[PDB]
């Protein structure tokens, strides 16, 4: 026996993410206390508290997303190389150990992909399978229909629900209530696969709760940016040049990525989490939190530096400095986007940062959040770590698939670049004025 | 019609006041002739597919999709004993009706001119302020609403008549789909009646409180000025509870 | 003789179940499993689990001491609500909190405990969820976190009139509920307030209650042991 | 229906005045028209399953689950001789009734409007202050309660009529399960009538005391002011005994 | 654990809030000396169990 | 450093999530057994043997 000492755990090492700053825990009054009275929109405010988290210093750039696209391209090319249809070289797909123990089939990224000049006929065909050439202009570009990322996510919060306990007796703690064997709990999950025809089949399965696999969601998402937004967002404008060169020019490498939908942003965050975990060694028992889109409460708290006296990501109430320089990239004048120097999104970090060290929280590109949009969502969310999370069913009405957008963009008026103004967009829609940055819950004491 | 995801979300979005350590039931008269309150009034009569709150309520009652209960003075009981029979509601209030050409979704045939969509000019809102045990915050929950028809009293004078009690859970699914405009300065139909009630955008004065004597404000306030004074006093009491909950603004240290 | 077989693993899902529409699953995953939370109060513990822990502590203590013949020791236990309130207020009837002053902050503006000071403002005292033990000043008796952090179980059964029905000396309202008893009879008193409580509930005189089989992300406990002193 | 654990716990919570060295019996009148006393009044008439104290008593008497005894002037005798017959209590007090459709838990058929749950606006509470021999502390025990009907005196004027005596032991099990709200500023039903009586939350004036002459205050206090003065004097006597018990606040040393 | 001496105290508060609608209830009592944990039980201490 | 049967006995108390593959102590297996003697009830006058 003895006394009551502690059973301590082995200390862990926390890898600080690259390109991120630390936002401390705190409290803020979300929303605006006073209304415009000419926009006819009532003022809604709510005080909340959030915990510390890592946040990207800038919005995701074209190069950072091109890294994701290139990873998808390389993985698909390697999968095709070690395939009977295109190649057949099994060296691209490890299926055994050095000792001969059968193991999970996985790609061998150690061996380089064959060069186009140095690769054989089958290798050339496998490489070309992921490209599309315009029959008229003879331009070879990655085929968007082939750039699909597959990934799975476990619903920890849904699995922890008392109603979702895998034992019926554990679903109700009130001893006055008896457990009914005929009671079945219906659960919904997302699954996706590739049929023999090569098409992506996605569906929402609704079935009685029986196992942990009921909380696993699988997605296959085409992740190539929708560069046509420039043309579609602006009729009667000469904006096809940006549709041709924005995501494909080296000069735009450090500019924020646009044309990315909510689903594509989630896929990018999942890929980033997978990459980070693959590139680190963790002590036994270590658990890390994945990269994710910020909640709208987290975004508003970070943008205003955790101070309720700020309407913008800067202390002053004015939109310019003492010398008349604008503090962000938006539409300051009527038909005048260039009053701040930039017409379309500018290079990230072109203005001053926050007190938190964040760039372009107002203007440039509007930013996706993980929060589902509701006209009364500030009232429906919780007081601590507020979140309104909805996983829409594939056959749900389109109206239920809207997600909150924060910050305002290069084409927005000063009203919409306020840190309290909420916008929304459909989860499958990419725009030339919407980008995103990621956050990561930080284990801090 | 609703998916499993939608049902789970909606069940997650409901307000539960089961273990609240503090409760207060308040009755408010919301007058539709005031700005920020006419949201439930527009349009006074149906405009194509556009109906106000009472038009929707009457249309749902003409079907069998909404159960309403008699407005009894002193108390509310939403039991089958007090469930209102639609046929014995129209002739009671002098609403001319005709036999229906379809027994499905139409118990009787009523013309829009007969329906008192524009006559109903006030509502009784039964709110419950509660203190959440787990979260330690104050919230408001709507329990029922009563439309008030304001026709012309026989022999002269005006007379306001409550019609019936509509439990909010019964009408919530139907009004969460009707998009409305919240202002005259902005005619975008971006909100719903459900958002209007949940956000507490209506402005009414208190006419009754759940007290131990079952007394209403009118029983001890003779004049309208005194009624307004008593409503202001009760509102000050509620705001005082809310303010006294917290201490961050007490700088006497 | 009463025999119990109690599942004693903490209910880590409390974080998810106490706070709908919040991102609290991180605490359901890390709070009891992270080495950084080692010195933080244990939550998600039920009254029965706390009793089992106290019994195990008594057995462990007995197993490691040599006792002269005839020596009978008292076991570890949850405090009575009267004992808890006496210890929290330093045995002084002029104290409303576990400190001398009536305010909630020092002269320099620092809060005296970890609770919810502001509206939607948990972090005004520097901590949102429970903080590491001994993060504030102790009692005159030398006790930490008697107000805030986690509310604490007591052995007293809850009755709306329980102060009147207890004794004057060593007050205790003890009930061993039957398995088939109505659920309303299985409530136990809770004291102190937690990280999510307004200043009213961290007062040493306020009484809360919880069902004996329910664990919460804001209810912990500490043990007491009757001392043989002269 | 109770468990052995519950029976043992309950019999452990009963107050015993067997060997008290000091006793005093006091008959107080509690007026239901005062806040902190209307706890026994709400609701004046049954609101669904919600009933006030007299509604519960009347319903229990309509069954055979409660024995009540006649209110005699001068003394109380809870013996089978004085047991009240429900039949010869409705006509004596003008309560209309019809033959019961069932003989199980229904002696007769009385409508809610006929049951005088709102007319009973006062109670007679018979308390016993006692000194505990083993513990050396003062406590109050409830012996009986008498509902007083406050109807209208015939030929004008008002008239208060005590109805019957209800020994507190008989009614204790039934009122220990019904939850009520103790305030108009907090409508949470977190307490019971048994808690209300056991905590002595009622405020009444002493109308009688046990004395060697069997005198009620009304026989030597001719006016309400003098009755209030006498009640204050007797309350001062009780508080004086309680205070003189102890010497911990006497700094004359 | 620290030692808590025997003594007496008036449990409860004499004055209520009047906005919470909860009447004040107070009772003086006495308790004997006992050991009490300096802090509430931590994660590691329960992990030992 | 154990054997096959030892590994089985050790794993008997652990549970692995089939999806995410995390091995944690099975809550349904962490059960503590203990007895308590009711001294106060045994000392009651009515409970004399
Ligand atoms: C690369 O990605 C593309 C998607 O962008 C995949 O292509 C898709 O699928 C093919 C079959 C079809 O043409 C289309 O549907 C297309 O969209 C492509 O298959 C590649 O992804 C797949 O292969 C990866 C790989 O081999 O690296 C997988 O990566 C992971 O695989 C392992 C799965 O268990 C995992 O190992 C496990 O975890 C590690 C940490 C370690 O514990 C180890 O022992 C475990 O076994 C790897 O670390 C992952 O990198 C990828 O999931 C898979 O889809
Ligand atoms: C999503 O769901 C579909 C099925 O609706 C999966 O199946 C795909 O669809 C078919 C038409 C195509 O031919 C393939 O692409 C095929 O893979 C799809 O891949 C996605 O799968 C995900 O969801 C599954 C689910 O929820 O059903 C997950 O569980 C399944 O796989 C488990 C693998 O161990 C299996 O458990 C095993 O079998 C059972 C009978 C039992 O013996 C158990 O102990 C075994 O381990 C589950 O029962 C399956 O449901 C799947 O893993 C996941 O990728
Ligand atoms: O003394 C500080 C002073 O600050 C200001 C007000 O809040 C006063 O009530 C307070 O007394
Ligand atoms: O002198 C001390 C003084 O204290 C005070 C009262 O108790 C007085 O009766 C007493 O005389
Ligand atoms: C108007 O005045 C009357 C009499 O003072 C009050 O009863 C009422 O509440 C209001 O103040
Ligand atoms: C009023 O006055 C009468 C006459 O003195 C008293 O008997 C009574 O007690 C009260 O003081
Ligand atoms: Ca931006
Ligand atoms: Ca504590």
Chains linked to D by 3 or more Cβ pairs within 8 Å: B, C, E
> Is the shortest distance between the CB of D211 and ligand 4 below 6 Å?
no
Give the angle A391-A397-A398 at the CA atoms, nearest 5°.
80
Q: How far is CA E39 from CA C86, C224, F14, in A?
A: 16, 11, 31
Which of A78, A101, A150, A201 for mutating ligand 1's site (highest number of atoms within 8 Å of CB)? A150
Q: Do residues A352 and A327 touch, judged by C-beta distance below 8 A?
A: yes
H helix runs in A179-335, sequence order: 229-233, 240-245, 262-278, 296-303
Q: Do residues A151 and A191 touch, judged by C-beta distance below 8 A?
A: no
How close A378 comes to chain E (CA, Å)? Answer: 27
Which tokens in the block code for residue C112? 């005296």
Between CA A317 and CA B214 the distance in angstroms is 52
State residue B232 phi and psi, 5-degree precision: -65, -40
Q: How far is CA B170 from CA B49, B61, C114, C220, in A?
A: 22, 11, 42, 41
Q: Does the distance separating the beta carbons of A173 and C23 come in below 8 Å? A: no
Q: Do residues C77 and C155 touch, judged by C-beta distance below 8 A?
A: yes
Exposure pattern of F9-48 as b/e (b: 16+ CB <10 Å)? eeeeeeeeeeeeeeeeeeeeeeebebeeeeeeeeeeeeee
Q: For residue A268, how far is its CA from the centre of ligand 1 (angstroms)? A: 15
For chain C, say whether B190 makes contact (Cβ under 8 Å): no
Q: Taking each helix axis from N to C terminus, what angle separates A62-81 and A262-278, rounded to the nearest 10 degrees?
A: 70
Which are the contacts of C84, defined by CB distance < 8 A and separation ≥ 6? C152, C154, C191, C192
Between CA F14 and CA D235 the distance in angstroms is 68
Between CA D139 and CA D136 the distance in angstroms is 10
DSSP-derived letter for residue B131 is: E
Q: What is the torsion angle, in degrees rounded to the nearest 10, for the CA atoms of residue B191, residue B195, residue B200 and residue B201?
A: 10
DSSP-derived letter for residue B228 is: H
Q: Do residues A191 and A202 touch, judged by C-beta distance below 8 A?
A: yes
Report the residue count for chain C: 230
Q: How far is CA C70 from CA A205, C73, C226, D16, in A?
A: 68, 10, 18, 38
Q: How was this structure determined?
A: cryo-EM
Q: Taking each helix axis from N to C terminus, what angle separates A121-128 and A62-81, rounded to the nearest 10 degrees?
A: 140
Which residue in F16, F20, F27 has the most chain A C-beta atoms within 10 A of its own C-beta, making it the best mutation to test that interface?
A: F20
Which tokens in the block code for residue C38? 């080692």
Give the angle B68-B73-B75 at the CA atoms, nearest 5°.
70
Of D215, D204, D97, whose CA–CA distance to D140 is shortest? D204
Tokens 């919470």 — which residue?
E20
Q: Do residues B177 and A20 touch, judged by C-beta distance below 8 A?
A: no
Q: Do residues B26 and B141 touch, judged by C-beta distance below 8 A?
A: no
Between CA A348 and CA A258 the distance in angstroms is 13
Residues paired with B216 in a beta bridge:
B208
Q: Does the distance separating the beta carbons of C1 and F31 come in below 8 Å? A: no
State the first-to-last Cα distance of chain F, in angstroms, to the nearest integer: 56
* Three-state secondary structure string covering D72-124: CCCCCCCCCCCECCCHHHHCCCCCCCECCCCCCCCCCECCCCCCCCCCEEEEE
Q: Does the distance separating the beta carbons of F18 and A154 come in below 8 Å? A: no
For chain B, say whether A120 makes contact (Cβ under 8 Å): no
Radius of gyration of chain F (CA): 21
B4-12 LR contacts (CB < 8 Å, sep 24+): B4/A186, B4/A187, B4/A188, B4/A206, B4/A393, B5/A188, B5/A204, B5/A390, B5/A391, B5/A392, B5/A393, B5/A396, B6/A393, B6/A396, B6/A400, B8/A188, B9/A390, B12/C20, B12/C21
State residue A245 phi and psi, 5-degree precision: -125, -10
Q: Does the distance separating the beta carbons of A1 and C36 come in below 8 Å? A: no
Q: How far is CA C88 from CA B151, C103, C225, D130, E26, in A?
A: 64, 16, 16, 32, 16
User: Out of E10, E27, E34, whose CB is closest to C164?
Assistant: E27
Between CA A242 and CA A310 the distance in angstroms is 34
- Asked if residue A18 belongs to a known ligand binding site, the reply is no
* Three-state secondary structure string covering A257-287: CCCCCHHHHHHHHHHHHHHHHHCCCCCCCCC
Which tokens in the block code for residue A36? 């415009």
- Asked if residue A342 belongs to a known ligand binding site, the reply is yes
Which are the contacts of B23, defined by CB distance < 8 A and separation ≥ 6? B17, B128, B129, B130, B131, D186, D187, D188
Q: Does the distance separating the beta carbons of C38 and E41 come in below 8 Å? A: no
DSSP-derived letter for residue C37 is: G
Residues paired with A31 in a beta bridge:
A45
Nearest CA to ligand 1 atom 40: A278
Which tokens in the block code for residue A344? 């379309």
Burial class (CB in 10 A: 0-12, 13-18, 19+), C93: middle
DSSP assignment of B172-189, as one string? HHHHTS-EE---SS----
Q: Do residues A355 and A313 touch, judged by C-beta distance below 8 A?
A: no
Burial class (CB in 10 A: 0-12, 13-18, 19+), D25: middle
Exposure pattern of A71-89 as b/e (b: 16+ CB <10 Å)? bbbeebbbebbbbeebbeb
Between CA D100 and CA D86 the distance in angstroms is 13
- Asked if residue A2 belongs to a known ligand binding site, the reply is no
Q: Does the distance separating the beta carbons of C37 and E11 come in below 8 Å? A: no
Give the angle E11-E15-E20 at the CA atoms, nearest 5°.
105
Residues paired with E7 in a beta bridge:
E31
DSSP-derived letter for residue C140 is: S
Between CA C217 and CA C203 the distance in angstroms is 19
Q: How far is CA A320 from CA A411, C31, D78, D182, in A?
A: 17, 45, 90, 59
SS3 category, D37? coil
SS3 category, F16? strand
Q: What is the torsion angle, in degrees rounded to the nearest 10, for the CA atoms of residue A217, residue A222, residue A227 and residue A232?
A: -70
DSSP assignment of A389-410, as one string? -----TTS-GGG-EEEEES--T
- Asked if residue A224 belongs to a known ligand binding site, the reply is no
Burial class (CB in 10 A: 0-12, 13-18, 19+), A16: exposed
Which are the contacts of D220, defined by CB distance < 8 A and separation ≥ 6? none
Q: Does the distance separating the beta carbons of C175 and D9 come in below 8 Å? A: yes
The reply to whether omega before D43 is within 30° of 0 (cis) is yes
Q: Do residues C85 and E11 touch, judged by C-beta distance below 8 A?
A: yes
Between CA A352 and CA B127 the distance in angstroms is 48
Of C65, C82, C53, whose CA–CA distance to C174 is shortest? C82
Report the DSSP pairing between strands A366-372 and A434-435.
parallel
Kindly list the protein residues whose Cβ atom lies closer than 6 A to any atom of ligand 2.
Answer: A 189, 191, 193, 205, 213, 216, 218
DSSP-derived letter for residue A373 is: P
Nearest CA to ligand 2 atom 13: A195
Residues paired with A54 in a beta bridge:
A22, A440
Tokens 């009624």 — which residue?
B227
Between CA A165 and CA A157 the distance in angstroms is 12
Of C90, C91, C92, C117, whose CA–CA distance to C103 is shortest? C117
Which of chain D's residues have a Cβ under 8 Å away from the Cβ of B77? Answer: 47-48
Between CA A152 and CA A102 the distance in angstroms is 24
Chains D and C touch (3+ CB pairs under 8 A): yes
Q: Do residues A358 and A57 touch, judged by C-beta distance below 8 A?
A: yes
State residue D158 phi and psi, 5-degree precision: -105, 160
Q: Which residues of C touch F (CB under 8 A)?
A: 1-9, 52, 55-56, 59, 174, 176
Between CA C32 and CA C13 the distance in angstroms is 11
Which are the contacts of C219, defined by CB distance < 8 A and separation ≥ 6? C43, C45, C150, C151, C152, C153, C190, C194, C210
Half-sphere exposure of E45 (CA within 13 A, CB side): 24
Of E32, E13, B136, E25, whose CA–CA distance to C97 is shortest? E13
* Three-state secondary structure string covering A69-127: HHHHHHHHHHHHHCCCCCCCCHHHEEEECCCCCEEEEEECCCCCCCCCCCCCHHHHHHH
H helix runs in A133-187, sequence order: 156-159
DSSP-derived letter for residue C99 is: B
Between CA C12 and CA C28 the distance in angstroms is 5
Half-sphere exposure of B117 (CA within 13 A, CB side): 23
Between CA D197 and CA D142 the distance in angstroms is 8
Which of chain C's residues have a Cβ under 8 Å away from the Cβ of B248? Answer: 117-119, 121, 124
Residues paired with D129 in a beta bridge:
D24, D140
Residues paired with B50 in a beta bridge:
B47
SS3 category, B170? helix
Which tokens in the block code for residue D212? 């060697």
Between CA A177 and CA A155 the distance in angstroms is 28
Which tokens in the block code for residue F37? 């003697």
CA A224 to chain centre: 14
């Amino acid at each position: 026996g003895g006394e009551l000492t502690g059973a301590k755990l082995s200390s862990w090492n926390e890898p600080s993410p690259f390109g991120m700053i630390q936002v401390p825990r705190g409290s803020i009054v979300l929303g605006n206390k006073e209304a415009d009275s000419l926009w006819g929109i009532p003022a809604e405010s709510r005080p909340i508290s959030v915990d510390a988290f890592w946040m990207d210093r800038t919005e995701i750039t074209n190069a950072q997303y091109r890294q994701f696209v290139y990873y998808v391209r390389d993985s698909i090319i390697r999968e095709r190389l070690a395939d009977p249809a295109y190649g057949g070289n099994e060296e691209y797909k490890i299926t055994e150990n050095k000792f001969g123990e059968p193991v999970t089939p996985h790609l061998d990224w150690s061996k380089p992909i064959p060069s186009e000049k140095r690769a054989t006929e089958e290798e050339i065909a496998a490489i070309n399978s992921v490209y599309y050439t315009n029959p008229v202009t003879h331009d070879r570009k990655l085929n968007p229909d082939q750039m699909v990322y597959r990934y799975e996510v476990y619903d920890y919060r849904s699995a922890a629900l008392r109603e979702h306990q895998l034992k019926a007796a554990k679903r109700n703690l009130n001893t006055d209530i008896k457990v009914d064997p005929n009671a079945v709990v219906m659960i919904s999950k997302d699954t996706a696969f590739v049929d023999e025809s090569g098409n992506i089949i996605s569906e929402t399965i609704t079935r009685p709760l029986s196992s942990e696999y009921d909380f696993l969601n699988t997605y296959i998402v085409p992740i190539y940016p929708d560069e046509t937004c420039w043309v579609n967002d602006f009729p009667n404008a000469r904006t096809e040049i940006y549709t041709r060169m924005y995501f494909n020019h080296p000069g735009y490498d450090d500019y924020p990525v646009v044309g990315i939908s909510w689903e594509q942003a989630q896929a990018f965050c999942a890929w980033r989490s997978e990459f980070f975990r693959k590139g680190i060694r963790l002590p036994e028992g270590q658990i890390m939190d994945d990269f994710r889109l910020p909640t709208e409460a987290e975004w508003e708290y970070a943008a205003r530096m955790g101070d309720s006296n700020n309407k913008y990501p800067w202390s002053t109430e004015d939109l310019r400095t003492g010398r008349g320089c604008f503090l962000g990239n938006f539409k300051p004048g009527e038909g005048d986007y260039t009053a701040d120097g930039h017409l379309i999104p500018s290079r990230v970090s072109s203005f001053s940062p926050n007190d938190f060290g964040l760039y372009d929280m107002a203007g440039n590109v509007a930013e996706w959040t993980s929060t589902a949009f509701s006209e009364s969502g500030l009232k429906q969310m919780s007081d601590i770590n507020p979140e309104l999370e909805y996983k829409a069913a594939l056959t749900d009405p389109y109206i239920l698939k809207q997600k909150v957008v924060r910050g305002g963009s290069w084409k927005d008026v000063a009203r919409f670049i306020r840190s309290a103004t909420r916008s929304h967009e459909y989860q499958n829609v990419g725009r030339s004025y919407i980008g995103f940055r990621c956050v990561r819950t930080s284990i801090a004491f | 019609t609703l998916s499993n995801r939608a049902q789970e979300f909606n069940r997650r979005l409901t307000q539960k006041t089961d273990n609240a350590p503090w409760r207060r039931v308040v009755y408010r008269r919301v007058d539709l002739m005031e700005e920020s309150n006419a949201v439930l009034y527009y349009p006074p009569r149906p405009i194509g597919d556009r109906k106000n709150l009472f038009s929707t309520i009457f249309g749902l009652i003409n079907s069998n999709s909404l159960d309403v209960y008699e407005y009894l003075d002193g108390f509310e009981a939403f039991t089958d004993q007090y469930k209102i029979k639609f046929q014995e509601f129209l002739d009671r209030f002098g609403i001319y009706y005709q036999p229906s050409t379809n027994k499905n979704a139409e118990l009787f045939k009523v013309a829009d001119s007969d329906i008192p969509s524009a006559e109903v000019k006030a509502y009784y809102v039964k709110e419950e302020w509660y203190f959440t045990p787990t979260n330690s915050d104050v919230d408001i929950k709507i329990q029922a609403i009563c439309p008030i028809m304001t026709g012309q009293d026989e022999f002269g004078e005006v007379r306001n008549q409550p019609l019936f009690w509509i439990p909010y859970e019964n009408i919530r699914p139907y009004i969460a789909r009707e998009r409305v405009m919240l202002s005259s300065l902005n005619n975008t139909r971006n909100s719903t009646i459900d958002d209007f009630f949940r956000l507490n955008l209506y402005k009414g004065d208190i006419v009754k409180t759940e007290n131990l004597h079952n007394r209403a404000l009118a029983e001890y306030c003779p004049t309208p000025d005194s009624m307004k004074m008593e409503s202001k006093r009760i509102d000050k009491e509620l705001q005082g509870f809310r303010d006294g909950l917290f201490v961050t603004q007490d700088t006497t240290w």
